[PDB]
Design a protein around this ligand. Sequence first.
Ligand code: NA
Ligand code: NA
Lengths: 229, 228
Amino acid sequence: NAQAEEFKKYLETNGIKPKQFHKKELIFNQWDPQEYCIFLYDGITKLTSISENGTIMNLQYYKGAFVIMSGFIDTETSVGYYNLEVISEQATAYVIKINELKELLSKNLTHFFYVFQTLQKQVSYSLAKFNDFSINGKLGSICGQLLILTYVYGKETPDGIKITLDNLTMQELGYSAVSRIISKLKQEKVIVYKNSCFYVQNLDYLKRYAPKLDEWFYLACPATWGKLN
Amino acid sequence: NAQAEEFKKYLETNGIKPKQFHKKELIFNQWDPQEYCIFLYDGITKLTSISENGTIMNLQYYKGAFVIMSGFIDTETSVGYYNLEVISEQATAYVIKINELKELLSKNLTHFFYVFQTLQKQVSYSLAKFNDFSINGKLGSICGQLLILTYVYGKETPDGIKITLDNLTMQELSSAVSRIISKLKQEKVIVYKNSCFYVQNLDYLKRYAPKLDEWFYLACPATWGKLN
Ligand code: NA
Ligand code: NA
């Protein structure tokens, strides 16, 4: 991606260097009083919220290049008590104290717009997920997740559309009611788990039950959306 | 609010002037190729979608002051096939062509930050609502909505936290939804008295909508403190 690469080298030229994180590490955490701007360049991360009960809530999954800010750009206070856990085996992210981000994005506004557009895509993505859910429930929720993963990491094989993402990661992404829906998916042969990898064989089904998230990926990632459309 | 007033003065000084809209009108729609940046200064609105079935879908609600954009700021293309419909009797909004907004923000970064943090507030609201769902179902969803309405338009009287809103607008604010709302009413969480609504068990709402309560504290503590 062009905007992401230009933003990376903008950060690097201003003295901000990348940082490596192995799986299960938190790039930021809900107890740190200092907020940051994570520019997740490479790897797969997970936004979590740990309540006092020790219970972990998976709120969102990000994949570089993306931007995740734990604090408000103006007040610098927490936008929510969240952690960013690396779920891939290793990830590369740029960590920028919320205050320095203002200085850096105020001089060069071209990448200011990049951060802006990432936030906008988050908004539209959440609204599309809410719509798909509110009509087709979790069947559509899981269909939309599988659909976007097929778009990004899917490439064709004699068996279907192989999800090239490593099995370990895909396990980290949850792959009673969820597994029941997934077993029905396997019943109608929409997806097939074979030879250590996932395969999508009926793309139109996932598209049918995730229309709004499909529209979202079309309006937000048209170049990659058209890979299998 | 203050930053909203400053953004208004920035739009005014820069030639952009407001427009008045009426209930059921659309500030923008899902068929217009031109995308805009709406600075909803006053009134209440909802972002809706029309699925292939053809029936309305209420996605989000917005109070002024706030910002709602139909297209991305870089490509100027749609972020989604949505319509902004006024549910208040009157609404005052500034409709800025998206292309112009880029230059306008680039000239002053303070108002850029205002719009950016509005987006951040949206993001955090969506995440907190999803968490409240994962925890307590639609019950917590509607409890969070009632909680936000209580904080915003809540004036405390002995009959409870009276709701400033005209009940015409609350008519806009479906089986299961009305079923849970009426059960909240029957459990005397929200009573009806003297032609108005009164939240007499705010703690119930706080209990079944904790993540959005935290969100409101972290994003608007000014009004959060009044009822806490
Ligand atoms: Na933090
Ligand atoms: Na539009």
